[PDB]
Amino acid sequence: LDEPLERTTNSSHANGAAQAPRSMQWAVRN
Amino acid sequence: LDEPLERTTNSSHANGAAQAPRSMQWAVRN
Amino acid sequence: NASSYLTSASSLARAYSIVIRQISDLMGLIPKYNHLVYSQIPAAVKLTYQDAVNLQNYVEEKLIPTWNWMVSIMDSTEAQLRYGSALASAGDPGHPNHPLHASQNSARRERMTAMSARGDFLNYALSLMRSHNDEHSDVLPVLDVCSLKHVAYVFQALIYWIKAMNQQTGQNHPFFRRSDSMTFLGCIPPNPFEVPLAEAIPLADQPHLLQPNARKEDLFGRPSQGLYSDRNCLEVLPTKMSYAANLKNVMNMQNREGPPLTSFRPQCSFMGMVISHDMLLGRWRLSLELFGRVFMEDVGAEPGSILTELGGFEVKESKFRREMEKLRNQQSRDLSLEVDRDRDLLIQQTMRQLNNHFGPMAVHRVKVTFKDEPGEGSGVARSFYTAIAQAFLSNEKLPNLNAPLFYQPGKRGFYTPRPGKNTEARLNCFRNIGRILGLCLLQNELCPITLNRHVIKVLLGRKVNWHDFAFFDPVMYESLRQLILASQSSDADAVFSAMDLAFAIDLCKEEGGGQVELIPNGVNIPVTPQNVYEYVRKYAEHRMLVVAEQPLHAMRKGLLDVLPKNSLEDLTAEDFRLLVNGCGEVNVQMLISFTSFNDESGENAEKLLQFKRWFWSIVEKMSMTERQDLVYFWTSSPSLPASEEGFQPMPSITIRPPDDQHLPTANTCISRLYVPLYSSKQILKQKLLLAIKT
Amino acid sequence: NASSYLTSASSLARAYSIVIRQISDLMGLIPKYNHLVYSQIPAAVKLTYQDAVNLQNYVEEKLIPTWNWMVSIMDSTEAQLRYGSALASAGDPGHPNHPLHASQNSARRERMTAMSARGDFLNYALSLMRSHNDEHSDVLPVLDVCSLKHVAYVFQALIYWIKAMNQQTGQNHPFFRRSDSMTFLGCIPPNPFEVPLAEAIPLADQPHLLQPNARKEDLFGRPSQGLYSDRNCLEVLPTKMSYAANLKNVMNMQNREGPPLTSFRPQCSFMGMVISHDMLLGRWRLSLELFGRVFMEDVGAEPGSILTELGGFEVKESKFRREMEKLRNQQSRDLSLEVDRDRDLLIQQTMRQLNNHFGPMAVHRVKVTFKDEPGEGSGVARSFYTAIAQAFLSNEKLPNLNAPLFYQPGKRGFYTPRPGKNTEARLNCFRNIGRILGLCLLQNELCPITLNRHVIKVLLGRKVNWHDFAFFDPVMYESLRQLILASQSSDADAVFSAMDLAFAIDLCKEEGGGQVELIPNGVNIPVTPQNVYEYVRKYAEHRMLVVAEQPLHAMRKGLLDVLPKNSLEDLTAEDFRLLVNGCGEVNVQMLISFTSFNDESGENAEKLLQFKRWFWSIVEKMSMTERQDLVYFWTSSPSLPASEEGFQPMPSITIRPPDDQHLPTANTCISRLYVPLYSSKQILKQKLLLAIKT
Amino acid sequence: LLDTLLGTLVKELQNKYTPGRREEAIAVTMRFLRSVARVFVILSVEMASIPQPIGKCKRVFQALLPYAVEELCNVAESLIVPVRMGIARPTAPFTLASTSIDAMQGSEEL
Amino acid sequence: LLDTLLGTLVKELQNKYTPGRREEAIAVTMRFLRSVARVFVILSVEMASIPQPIGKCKRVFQALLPYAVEELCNVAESLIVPVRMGIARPTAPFTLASTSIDAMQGSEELFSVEPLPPRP
């Protein structure tokens, strides 16, 4: 589908937008 | 040295800083 | 590694925050100037009382426009976030324009490519023009909070300065008031009597809502703020999305020998009124929550950060885990244990060996050996932990040296101690249970024994209130809430002279006998028109604190025998539950994110991509008891840790060359599972269900 | 193809400029409302006189803070640029910290890698703190004007609105005033009498300064502005670099039936005074020059752009070249010519064939054929052009059908016509010269015949002034300037009664005879105390316009026989010189940037890299006569075009497999030179000097 | 239809007979001019450097000049706020429209 | 040497005997505090999340508090101007300093420079 099936080893290069909650996810990008 | 010895075919991807005059060249980047 | 505007803006804002912190530290030394500065340094100037007032007026004059800028931006951002939260609960979740849709995830949009650049700017401009005249109904606003990093530094600096200046019975009884673990700063808590349990404490009604990424708002109720109508800007709720309108309101509400140096006390006054940081924190709660979620790695690393002080689960669990690792590696004293796979001899050998070992502790490692069984890995300790947990939680009898130790007060899956005419054996058993939980917390493992919230709060040293009774027995909590609500009716004594309750209670079989009084003089004092709050609080503290005081004291002393009084500080019941018991139920998403999928078969059936999908569909289509038996086949534990740092070996599924002859094998000490590649999905499902039962 | 702050800022500023242009177009229709709107549309509202004043007050109220923002930013940028220009002329050019150093080039810093990121931000912050209290001496300021694109759109919109509102004798004689080709808008021109020629018109003293990238300031003198001391912000020269200080000055100087609709005339008033766009253009001249240099491709493409109206050489030459291409491809009538390599029969056949061909033109192509010589390429026309140029410029005699046509008035390399008792043959020769220049301009070629500035200004249709006499004869220009300066002395008649000059002049041999009077009644009127300006202007217009009126009229008519009166509009003498005669001298940098270096030998001596360096060192170490002979060996022309668009075939050097036996070969019609690879640098130099002489 | 709508708006704006009609028509005109200004801004940003819808918007602005000037001032003020305060949301660059059908295609989806 | 300089500055600041001494000492104190504030800002930006030079700067600020507060307000105001007006010059990201020797190495190249010499 779209969900990855294994760990990506976190890939570095993070901006913190993935740590946003599910309710406030439309207000962040990347 | 540092000056290229032939045409670079202009390479696209221009920001206009190369068109600045010699007197005002320290005030622009890229 | 390229030039950007936002990096320079964030760096300049960080420099500004550094200088503002230095200014605050300089202004904080004025009332103790002659003791700290004019007693040690050979060179200092003379400071008078009027010069401090002139300095305060100068600093309050020179921090006006950045304050207006920050307040306008934060007000517009909070208005946009609150309108998004309001539109989320009034729209159709199946529509793609809903905020709680799978299409709104930023990571899901990037993975779906494997819209146009003009359309994004056109939508941003159309949201900009509609927000000017309050014409933005049924449209989700367009904003990026992750590009607002330079605002957060200035906000943190100004909150630092405000906080530095600020710090330099019947119904109104402290039993019906929530503690700091259930309130919000600057917000009005909900009414404990006029609100039912389904929308006041939803964690008590649904215990499965506890997640490591779960918010505080959907676990303990919706807070409210009493700010409406008042001419100042800080007394009005921000409802307008426009930056220009909010800036207009901020400016319009803006321009609407003597005493000794010890008596100088500054007061915060920006806009003609006294300003406390609690109402500023409560005014922008959603923006502060999102700022703590996305800006902890750099903005939260500043000294005196308000994001670290308002941190959630991930801030505290990392500090606790690194302190546990440091205290574990500080000493080098090992502990050894020999047990056998049964109940009675297992618990007898456990009590004997745990009494013989320090009959604070400095245990470095714990080694467990099963009698007449091989194995010396780290998973043997986890198997011992789940074995002693299911042995203590089982209900058969007391294996010599008589009542069972634990019982359920009315909620499934949670336990409270049973006193049962406490002798020296039961107290030593509870001290051993507390020491077992202490070593489990020290060794970074999971002990599958679940206690109620008040039982955890006794161990941590927190005051038990009326809201903790909802985690003990919810139905009679609701019945007593309706009794309080009917006790203030207009008929008064008409409902009071109907049942004629007394101040004595009939206890259940597990709690003891029956017909036990609450107050002195016993049954001869009935319920008066005004005694009902006293009756409720005496009943609650009798059933939660009086009956099982000695087992709770024994477990507290057992927990304190291993752990000091410097790690349970600033801990809560919920992160104690998440650190010891894990997440509870087993989900698919975290188990997907924990696996590694080592490949060693060398077979190329469409570059795999179908066996893994069939495997995860088998896991997702599996009952929870079989899921717990599955996780017991991975790492010999029935529960998962809360985060990736609870796994000292990483989980690993490793494929094998195809051979339809044997069940998949388990290596517990390295958390590895070797599985042979199969052909049919039904064959894989049958083999998995046969392998997990063992 | 990535998200950036500056792209969104520029797009929002472009949208704002569009709306401001629409507002300006709506406000411009008020005095003619009842004729243009309330006579055609069936639905319109009624507009009164007071409503227009209320609208003007509303718009002037609602464009204050963006005006303050733009004016503060432009003032700080102009102050930084002017301090950089002041420090450039007072420091050592050999130091690496000098502005006119090779290390300050942005392209040279990137090529040198094949400083750190912390040091750049630290230097930017240190320049930021030093600029606050005017503590920035002997340090070049740190700024990037290329990141200020969103300011330029707002500036362009506000100048558009100001310009739309604004548009809706002795010493004070119009002969000593400069034209629009030598002045600056909003700036005071230099004094033509008290300033010597070395620092007033440096192009007249040094004619080699004319370059396609040369500025206007170092060709025609330094302008001055009379703005100092006056309480308004627009009457004070901007000298402070700080944005906060400039914003403070802007705000402090800020808050320091009736008539018919036809009589409504708006006036620009932002800051309590009338505002003209000329002084706003003169206030920020360096910033506008740099904005036109770096922001023409996107910001200059807007309708009604002030950067396109203030465009330099590259803006006008592109428009002229595309109009020439369109008018050339409009028609399909060809021209053929047969000539022979000599002087007398060449000029006779040229006159006969050019008279026979249209004895406006619609020439599509020009084909030239040499008698008893092969060749039909495009370089034959260039060889014919340089041959007819050197035939007309040579001084032997007049080849029948007697004086030579051109002569030098005192500056080497520039020519003016000689009348010489003009018959019908000389006038037809000058008409043919004008038609030859017209076809050379039409066919995108270079004719190496050089005229003086006033000769070009007669053809373009421009008024000749006193400053054009410095391009005619500089030494007696200086002598007459000292005569004007001594004519206003305190002794007055003491120096006047020393030589006793009259109103008659002795002409030279080329101009004619001698003893010719200027005014009526002849020699009997000597120099009075006050007649000297009249004597100077009559002498100047006699020697520049009276003697050679008929040849200039003949050349103007010859130029107008081919070219219409719609292409010489908005042309200047200098871009006419750059379009017809090229750059003049031959430089190495443009010749390096024009070459291609096709490789076909297949030999790998250190991946070449040494033969090319030796070749360019040979070219750089070569005398200019040999350079002109070299360029005559490339494309059969002694001069280079001003830009890359003047080459319809691109220049090409093509290497050959090594053979030390033959001279390099030339293909003129495709601008290619086939050179064999050699071993020694001295061998290459000797072969090149032997090949160029032919 | 555009002149019919404009004639109805002007006729109700020039109605000094019944009470409350003039301010009601003024507010209706403000809302309609806000919508027209938003459509005109989107179309003018999407085009490059006159088309028929821009001419229709210009005709609407010319027929209602003293209110369209104020509403365009408000629209520009709203567009220029996020640039001056330094809080603009980052976006990707895009190319302009040489023709008019692609601008209509892009404004259809908005 | 730091206490010697501070003692000289305080002694000349408390001199109500000769005319014109107090404002002259005030202006000298403003210029010295501006230089100290610039050095402190550069050192504090270069460090990560007390070192000896930052402690010396804090001692200088504490010995001259009512003027250092005003000059630090001016320094912060100058630092915060380009962020609020949206005209910040873009720069590349850089890593912070875990130790103190690398911060001294980076601040050596910024302050130990020479002015532009005049034209010969």
Residue numbers in the entry:
A (entry chain G), B (entry chain F): 1691 to 1720
C (entry chain B), D (entry chain E): 1773 to 1886, 1911 to 1964, 2016 to 2076, 2091 to 2117, 2162 to 2264, 2271 to 2312, 2501 to 2793
E (entry chain D): 1397 to 1445, 1453 to 1513
F (entry chain A): 1397 to 1445, 1453 to 1523
What do the authors report?
UBR5 has key roles in stem cell pluripotency, tumor suppression, oncogenesis and other important pathways. The structural data reveal a ≈ 620 kDa UBR5 dimer as the functional unit, comprising a scaffold with flexibly tethered Ub-associated (UBA) domains, and elaborately arranged HECT domains. Our data show how a full-length E3, ubiquitins to be adjoined, E2 and intermediary products guide a feed-forward HECT domain conformational cycle establishing a highly efficient, broadly targeting, K48-linked Ub chain forging machine.
Indeed, an L710D variant at the dSBB interface prevented tetramerization and led to the formation of a catalytically active dimer. The N-terminal region consists of an interrupted RCC1-like domain (RLD) β-propeller, with UBA (not visible in the map) and dSBB domains inserted in blades 2 and 5, respectively. The central region is primarily α-helical but also embeds the UBR domain that has been proposed to bind substrate N-termini. UBR5’s C-terminal HECT domain initiates with residues not originally annotated as being part of this domain and adopts the L-conformation. The HECT domain L-configuration is stabilized by numerous interactions. One protomer’s DSD domain contributes to the extensive dimerization interface within the scaffold, while a peptide-like loop projects from the scaffold to bind the C-lobe from one HECT domain. Numerous additional interactions further position UBR5’s HECT domain, including between the central region and HECT domain N-terminus, and between the HECT domain N- and C-lobes.
